[PDB]
Amino acid sequence: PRKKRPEDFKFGKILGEGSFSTVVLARELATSREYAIKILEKRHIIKENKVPYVTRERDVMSRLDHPFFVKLYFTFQDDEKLYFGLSYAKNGELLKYIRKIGSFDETCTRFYTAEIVSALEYLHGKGIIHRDLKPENILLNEDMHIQITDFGTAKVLSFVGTAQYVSPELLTEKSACKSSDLWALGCIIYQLVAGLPPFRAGNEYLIFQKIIKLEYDFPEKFFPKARDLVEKLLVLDATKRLGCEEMEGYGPLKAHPFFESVTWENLHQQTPPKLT
Numbered sequence: 569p570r571k572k573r574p575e576d577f578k579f580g581k582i583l584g585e586g587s588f589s590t591v592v593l594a595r596e597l598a599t600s601r602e603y604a605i606k607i608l609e610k611r612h613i614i615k616e617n618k619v620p621y622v623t624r625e626r627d628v629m630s631r632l633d634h635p636f637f638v639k640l641y642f643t644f645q646d647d648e649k650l651y652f653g654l655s656y657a658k659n660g661e662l663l664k665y666i667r668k669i670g671s672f673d674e675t676c677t678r679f680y681t682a683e684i685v686s687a688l689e690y691l692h693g694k695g696i697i698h699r700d701l702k703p704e705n706i707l708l709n710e711d712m713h714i715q716i717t718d719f720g721t722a723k724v725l726s727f728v729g730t731a732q733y734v735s736p737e738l739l740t741e742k743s744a745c746k747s748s749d750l751w752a753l754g755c756i757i758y759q760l761v762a763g764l765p766p767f768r769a770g771n772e773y774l775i776f777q778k779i780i781k782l783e784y785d786f787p788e789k790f791f792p793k794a795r796d797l798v799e800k801l802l803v804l805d806a807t808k809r810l811g812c813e814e815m816e817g818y819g820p821l822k823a824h825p826f827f828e829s830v831t832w833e834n835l836h837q838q839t840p841p842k843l844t
């Protein structure tokens with residue numbers, strides 16, 4: 569199949585903006601298909617020494633083949649810019665829904681947590697670490713299943729993700745591991761239930777302080793089984809987090825009582841609970 573060009577598309581609104589890319593909604597003229605096209609400027613990438621990150625994004629996404637991940641359909645470039653044609657996840661960032669309805673009830677929390685767990689099991693099965701898992705990086709497609717994105721900063725078995733989801737080892741030994749993503753999962757579950765992430769403060773230095781001290785509390789309402797799970801994930805020692813290899817992997821994690829009524833095998837086939 570011939571390489572696509574910018575002229576093959578009618579570009580529309582901006583879906584996302586970051587430091588090194590802009591995601592634009594585009595309609596392909598030949599098919600009327602909609603893609604989220606991520607556009608990177610070559611000069612800026614080179615000037616900021618990000619070529620390894622752009623290269624890794626492309627390489628990681630081509631290896632992923634699972635419904636809970638944004639897919640890479642095509643790439644091309646012109647003189648100034650790289651273009652990656654990605655899945656258009658019509659309902660946007662999970663963060664928007666958390667802000668919109670405040671907290672998730674237990675059924676919605678359990679369902680979307682289970683999807684994120686299944687996605688991490690697949691990702692870690694590929695020897696890949698995300699390193700920046702967070703609600704902004706978890707999209708919702710038209711059917712309200714998740715699609716995780718943003719892989720330029722992944723590590724395939726230097727970088728620190730968004731402060732409130734950074735794991736202790738990142739701040740202490742400067743190392744990242746699969747377990748680092750499980751710390752982020754713990755933060756996300758907490759945020760889904762509480763409406764806010766567990767470690768928050770007026771600036772990044774203070775957030776970091778609280779993290780290494782494990783300084784946070786549960787709200788009185790917090791679903792008790794969800795609380796038990798979070799306490800097994802937000803563990804300073806990375807080798808003792810439920811789900812990590814030293815704890816015998818995803819079996820014990822998926823067996824946790826919070827997920828008692830989850831059918832793990834066909835989640836993306838299931839109708840998600842309505843979000844209120």
Ligand SMILES: NC(=O)Nc1ccc2c(c1)=C(Cc1cc(-c3cccc(C(=O)NCCN4CCCCC4)c3)c[nH]1)C(=O)N=2
Binds near residue numbers: 659660668
């Ligand atoms: N860093 C990255 O790789 N970022 C990416 C990658 C791929 C990608 C990407 C970002 C996408 C972003 C995106 C953003 C949005 C979006 C942006 C702004 C508003 C909305 C929107 O109104 N959605 C309706 C659903 N609810 C309605 C109620 C309020 C919350 C949102 C969606 C839709 N899709 C996307 O669809 N595909």
